[PDB]
Paper text:
The most relevant are the cysteine peptidases gingipain K (alias Kgp) and R (RgpA and RgpB), which cleave proteins and peptides after lysines and arginines, respectively. Kgp, which is responsible for most of this activity, is a 1723/1732-residue multidomain enzyme encompassing an N-terminal signal peptide, a pro-domain for latency, a caspase-like cysteine peptidase catalytic domain (CD), an immunoglobulin superfamily-like domain (IgSF), between three and five hemagglutinin-adhesion domains, and the C-terminal domain for type-IX secretion. Kgp degrades connective tissue and plasma proteins, for example heme- and hemoglobin-transporting proteins, fibrinogen, fibronectin, plasma kallikrein, immunoglobulins, as well as peptidase inhibitors, thus causing vascular permeability and bleeding. Taken together, these domains form an elongated structure that resembles a tooth: the CD forms the crown with the cusp at its top, and the IgSF, which is a six-stranded antiparallel open β-barrel, shapes the root.
Here, we analyzed the crystal structure of Kgp from P. gingivalis strain W83 in complex with KYT-36 to very high resolution (1.20 Å). KYT-36 is a L-peptide-derived molecule that mimics a substrate binding in extended conformation to cleft sub-sites S3, S2, S1 and S1’. The BOC benzyl group nestles in a hydrophobic pocket created by the side chains of H575 and W391, which together with Y512 and W513 create a shallow S3 sub-site in Kgp. The LYS group of KYT-36 simulates a substrate residue in P1 and thus matches the specificity of the enzyme. Its side chain penetrates the specificity pocket and its aliphatic part is pinched between W513, A451 and C476 through hydrophobic interactions. The terminal ε-amino group is tetrahedrally bound by D516Oδ2 through a salt bridge, by N475O and T442Oγ1 through direct hydrogen bonds, and by Y517N and W513O through hydrogen bonds mediated by a solvent molecule. The carbonyl carbon is just 2.02 Å apart (2.00 Å and 2.03 Å in the two Kgp molecules A and B found in the asymmetric unit of the crystal, respectively) from catalytic C477Sγ, which is roughly perpendicular to the carbon and its three bound atoms. In addition, the inhibitor carbonyl carbon is pyramidalized, i.e. not coplanar with its three bound atoms but shifted towards a tetrahedral configuration. Thus, the present structure simulates a state immediately previous to formation of the tetrahedral reaction intermediate of the nucleophilic addition. The complex structure of Kgp with its specific inhibitor KYT-36 revealed that the sub-nanomolar inhibition exerted by the inhibitor is based on 24 intermolecular interactions and the fact that the active-site cleft of the enzyme is blocked from sub-sites S3 to S1’.
Residue numbers in the entry: 229 to 681
Amino acid sequence: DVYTDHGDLYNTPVRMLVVAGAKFKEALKPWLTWKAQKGFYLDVHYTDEAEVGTTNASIKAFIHKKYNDGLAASAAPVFLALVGDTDVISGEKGKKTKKVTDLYYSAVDGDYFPEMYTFRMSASSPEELTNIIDKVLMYEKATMPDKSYLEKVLLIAGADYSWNSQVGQPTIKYGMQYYYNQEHGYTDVYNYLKAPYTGCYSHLNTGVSFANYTAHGSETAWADPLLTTSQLKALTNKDKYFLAIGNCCITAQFDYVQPCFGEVITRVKEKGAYAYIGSSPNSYWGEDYYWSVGANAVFGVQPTFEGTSMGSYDATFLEDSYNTVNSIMWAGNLAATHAGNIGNITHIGAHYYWEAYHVLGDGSVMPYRAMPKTNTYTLPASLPQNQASYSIQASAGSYVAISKDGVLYGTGVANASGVATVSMTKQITENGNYDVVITRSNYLPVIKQIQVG
Ligand SMILES: CN(NC(=O)CC[C@H](NC(=O)OCc1ccccc1)C(=O)N[C@@H](CCCCN)C(=O)C(=O)NCc1ccccc1)c1ccccc1
Ligand SMILES: [Ca+2]
Ligand SMILES: [Ca+2]
Ligand code: NA
Ligand code: NA
C-alpha cells in the first residue's frame, strides 16, 4: 500500500542538501555547524554559484542533478533545506493547487511523491534567519531552563457550524485518547473542542511543546479562535519553543504580499515556533481529517486506532520511525493518499495535498514527546589516530557523530546491543579536542569531547 511504497525517508548517515540565498551565508553558519556536529553530512550551496543559478528552473535542475548523482553513488540526500523567501528561491505554482509550492524541488522522478524531506527556512533578513536558528539550537541542544514546558500541548478544534462536531472534535479527541495524555507523560493537555475558546492562546505564552489547530485559516491567522500575525509578534514564550501545525487554509502561503502566518511564527525572535506545518492553498475538511487520524475515519463517528490507518498523530508516536518534523507532514499526506486508494470520501485529492502542505522552519528537528529521556553511553578514553572506525557505546538506535571545528569526521548507529561502530569518512590525523554528539528520538542529546594528543 502507499505506506510500504513510500515510507519515512529518514536514513543514516544523514545527508542534507542545502540551497540558500547568498545573503544568508554568515547567519547560517551556527546552524550548519550544529547539523554537522550531530552527524549530518552537509552539501551546502548558494544562489551566487554558477551551477545553482538564480531562477526556479536553474535551482530545480541543480537540486534534481544533486539527488540523482547522490542516489547513483549510494548517497542520496535525505533532507533538502531551502534557505530564503520567494525573492531568492521562488517555488512555482502547483498544477492542482494554483498556489506556490516547493514540491517540485523535491519531486525528482515522474510522480508527485518527494525524493527528499524538504523544508524552507524562510527569512527576509539575516537577523530573521538567526531568530529561527537560535530557537532550533536551544530546542535540539535542550539548553532551555524550563524543560517542564515539553510536557504540555495545545489542541484546538476551531469554529465551524457543521464541521466542528463532525470532524474537528473527533480529530482532537483521537489525538488525546491515544497520545496527548498523562499515560504518555503530558501533564497539561490544554484542549478547546468548541466555544467558548476564551483564553486558549494564553498557553502559547506559558509554554507548550506542540500546538495544533484544525478549522478555518487565512494567510495571516488561525481564524477562529483568532490568532493573528500581529498577536504572534507579542508572544512571550522565551526559551519555550514549539512545533505548530495549522490544519486549515492558506497559513503557509509563503509568496503572499505580506509574510504569512507560518513565516511569522518561525521568524519571531525568542518566541513562537521552531517549525510550522501548514498549507499554502486551501485545505479541506475530509483530507485534513485523514491527515491527522488516518484513513477510514468517518464524519461524525469517533475514530479508533483499530478502525483507521496510520495518520500523522499515529506516526509521530511510533517510537522507531516518523521522528522528524518533516515525517509528521509526510505521514499526514500518506493518510490522505491512502484514503483515496481505498475509496473513502475525498474532497480534493492526493496530488493537491503533496503540493499543498509545507514545512516552514526546520523540518529536520526530531520533536520530543513529553519529557525526553536521559540516554546511556560510554565514551572511549582516547581516539587513536589513523583508524577507519571507533566503537562508542550508547542506547540501541542512538546516532553517534565525531567532528571537529564543525567538520563531520564519522558517524554510526548503535546496534541492538548498544554498540555504535563509528565509520570515519575523515580519519583523525591531528591532535585536538574532538566533539562527540549522541542523539536519539525523544532523548536529551549528549554533547561531549575527547582529547587526541
Ligand atoms: C478560503 N475560502 N474557503 C473555501 O473556499 C473553502 C475551502 C475548504 N472547503 C472544504 O473543506 O470543503 C469540504 C467539503 C466538501 C464537500 C462538501 C462540503 C464541504 C475549507 O473550508 N477550508 C478551510 C479549512 C478546512 C479544513 C480544516 N481542517 C479554510 O481554512 C477556509 O475555508 N478558510 C477561510 C476563512 C478565512 C478567514 C476567516 C474564515 C474563513 C473562502 C474564503 C472566503 C469566503 C469563502 C470561502
Ligand atoms: Ca518521486
Ligand atoms: Ca514570504
Ligand atoms: Na489511525
Ligand atoms: Na515517531
